[PDB]
């Protein structure tokens, strides 16, 4: 006569949360965007189809110079590519071959990665002794790693498959703070443009707005209906759109605190795996499992464009920090550049 | 622009060094047969003749990966194992209803849309424990069609083993075979075995050789 009391009280809490979400929801975005003009048929073709990988590319992150890009494979390679002259800059052989994430630092001096080895390995690129080598390894998780991101040159934030995100300091080498509260595998992170608070999409059909300062789940978004695979904050920081296995994208916002937009057609039946925005925030790029990448209008929910291309599914997508290119990394061992 | 061209030439030299290193890694990758082990440890007699295991049989190098240090929501890391060659699915065949959930995990591995090209080596340990389990009277409480599943005509049992033991043994073998034939186009085949101690890696090597040969015959459209 104790446990049921607070869980029906939690049900009542969820009831007034839903009442507060409904009462502040006078007009959806899709009915007040009909006054603005669509962006028409957007053609983008392959500028450089960079070919270096022996196996499927599972992750990718552009550099803040919008020139270099890390690509990690289940080959066991992490090869750092120069996107203009379509050639290699580094090739790091990893410790465990199954890696699922990679992150090029905003300074450029480090590259983190991690996979089923439960360890975030941070490689240095600016060693005075020449060759690249593992500057730090981070081992405090009990599940795998799905997405790691650099807040700055000094501290990483990791998403794991044991319901935890984590802020790690690299110099100390242990978890500065944890982030618990999910119930499923936490599949993707997204840092805000001011890097004070990150959004985490997981396998409980929810996305939690955390914050790295004091370390708590300040917001929680339950609008999806399947496992959320990828997430990316809107370029201002007030919204984020995220995609899940139910073959849709959903745009949420961090202040109105509900779902704003749903992106799904009748041909869209494959659960998606990557989202990103343009620099303006108008094009929600989303890479899927029907081997294509839809280019959604992030304000009017139309298929503005369709990236054709890859022979197997995509698994990572990244837009440059000046908005110049859309790199899609896939399972046919290539990653192509779109523009 | 002189130092531009010299920097581009140095970058192209780095490109050629990395490209020849990656073709050497292609020649060591495309001949490395790797296999997922996903059964309740026990591989200590498979390695000796924490996650991975690089061993070798007859100039063919295998890369076993054990997944004991993950959670049991398997639906997100098991999608990493696409280019893997075989899945050693180990069934502790007697001890609850472990067998039906093992069948459900095998059905889920079988019908997953990113694992519908790779094949499952199927080991079944504890067959002596299943022998004293069928001689005690408990699979008949779990499986009703076992009451009328007659012993097959293509049986290759142990000479001297009790007929109820081989009855339950080939019953659950054909139940895994019913799952692995009820949904498939011939892209991948379950390879059942029964063990436990002996050279299990000989069965692993023969079955992975059969997987590679059937894949090469499917891509010539001979099979």
């Amino acid at each position, epitope marked *: 006569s104790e446990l049921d009391q607070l869980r029906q009280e939690a049900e009542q809490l*969820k009831n007034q949360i*839903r009442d507060a979400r409904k009462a502040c929801a006078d007009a959806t975005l899709s009915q007040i965007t009909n006054n603005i003009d669509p962006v028409g048929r957007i053609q983008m073709r392959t500028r450089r189809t960079l070919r270096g990988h022996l196996a499927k590319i599972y992750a990718m992150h552009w550099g803040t110079d919008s020139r270099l890009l890390v690509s990690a494979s289940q080959d066991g390679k992490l090869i750092i590519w120069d996107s203009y002259t379509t050639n290699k800059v580094h090739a790091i052989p990893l410790r465990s071959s199954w890696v699922m994430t990679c992150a090029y630092a905003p300074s450029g001096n480090y590259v983190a990665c991690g996979g089923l080895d439960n360890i975030c390995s941070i490689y240095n690129l600016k060693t005075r002794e020449g060759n690249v080598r593992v500057s730090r390894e981070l081992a405090g998780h009990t599940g795998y790693l799905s997405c790691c991101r650099f807040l700055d040159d000094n501290q990483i934030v990791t998403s794991s498959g044991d*319901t935890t995100c984590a802020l790690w300091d690299i110099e100390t080498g242990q978890q500065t703070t944890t982030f618990t509260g999910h*119930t*499923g595998d936490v599949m993707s992170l997204s840092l805000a443009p001011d890097t004070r608070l990150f959004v985490s999409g997981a*396998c*409980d*059909a929810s996305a939690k707005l955390w914050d790295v300062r004091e370390g708590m789940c300040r917001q929680t978004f*339950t*609008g999806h*209906e*399947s*496992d959320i695979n990828a997430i990316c904050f809107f370029p201002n920081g007030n919204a984020f759109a995220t995609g899940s*296995d*139910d*073959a849709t994208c959903r745009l949420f916002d961090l202040r109105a605190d509900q779902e704003l937009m749903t992106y799904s057609h009748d041909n869209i*039946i494959c*659960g998606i795996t990557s989202v990103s925005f343009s620099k303006s925030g108008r094009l929600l790029l989303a890479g899927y499992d029907d081997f294509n990448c839809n280019v959604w209008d992030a304000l009017k929910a139309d298929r503005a464009g369709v990236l054709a291309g890859h022979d197997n599914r995509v698994s990572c997508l990244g837009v440059t920090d000046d908005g110049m290119a859309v790199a899609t990394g896939s399972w046919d061992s290539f990653l192509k550049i779109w523009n | 622009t002189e130092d531009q061209r010299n920097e581009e030439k140095a970058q192209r030299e780095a490109n050629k060094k990395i490209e020849k290193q990656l073709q050497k890694d292609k020649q060591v990758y495309r001949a490395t047969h790797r296999l997922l082990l996903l059964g309740a440890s026990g591989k200590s007699t498979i390695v000796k003749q924490i996650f991975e295991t690089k061993f070798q049989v007859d100039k063919v190098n295998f890369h076993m990966f054990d997944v004991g240090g993950q*959670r*049991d*929501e*398997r*639906r997100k890391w098991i999608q990493c194992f696409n280019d893997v060659t075989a899945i050693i699915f180990v069934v502790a065949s007697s001890s*609850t*209803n472990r067998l*039906q*959930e093992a069948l*459900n*995990l095998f*059905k*889920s*591995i*079988w*019908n*997953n*849309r990113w694992l519908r090209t790779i094949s499952v080596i199927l080991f079944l340990n504890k067959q002596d424990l299943l022998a004293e389990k069928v001689l005690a009277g408990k699979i008949e*409480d*779990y*499986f*009703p*069609e076992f009451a009328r599943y007659t012993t097959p005509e293509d049986a290759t049992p142990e000479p001297g083993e009790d007929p109820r033991v081989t009855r339950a043994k080939y019953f659950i073998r054909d139940e895994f075979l019913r799952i692995s034939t009820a*949904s498939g186009d011939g892209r991948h085949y379950c390879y059942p075995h029964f063990t436990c101690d002996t050279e299990n890696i000989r069965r692993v090597f023969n079955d992975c050789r059969d997987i590679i040969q059937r894949m090469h015959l499917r891509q010539y459209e001979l099979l």
Partner: nanobody, 128 residues
Framework: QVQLQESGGGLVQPGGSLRLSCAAS????????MNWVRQAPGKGLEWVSD????????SYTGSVKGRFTISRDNAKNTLYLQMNSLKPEDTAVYYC?????????????????????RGQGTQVTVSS
């Protein structure tokens, strides 16, 4: 929000009949194959039944073959499980876990009590 409210069950003499149901709201019910899982006291979660997206391809666990029957209605967004000829082995906490993807034929929801898309649970105790 994916929520799964189940109702039914209680104290029934073994040999009678019983009925569980669960309403499923938060998604398109017409696209997920559905399951029924149970937790026996002193054991883990064990699978009982599956049904496909439409309702044709049904499957049961071996211990309930002929005894139990599940049936889904997307027009009501709910699922019913009829327990005919109840047994003393059926004293368990009952769960209607769904499967996490549209238009698929695989499920990974017999976990060690950590799954998000699963109901709260109905205790069905079988005594004298």
């Amino acid at each position: 929000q994916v929520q799964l409210q189940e109702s039914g069950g209680g104290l029934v003499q073994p040999g009678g009949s019983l009925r569980l149901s669960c309403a499923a709201s938060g998604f398109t019910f017409s696209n997920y194959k559905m399951n029924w899982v149970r937790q026996a006291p002193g054991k883990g979660l064990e699978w009982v039944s599956d049904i496909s997206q439409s309702g044709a391809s049904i499957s049961y666990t071996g211990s309930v073959k002929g005894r139990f029957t599940i049936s889904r209605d997307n027009a009501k967004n709910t699922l019913y499980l009829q327990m005919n000829s109840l047994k003393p082995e059926d004293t368990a906490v009952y769960y209607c876990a769904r499967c996490p993807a549209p238009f698929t034929r695989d499920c990974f929801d017999v976990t060690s009590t950590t799954y998000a898309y699963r109901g709260q649970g109905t205790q069905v105790t079988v005594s004298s």
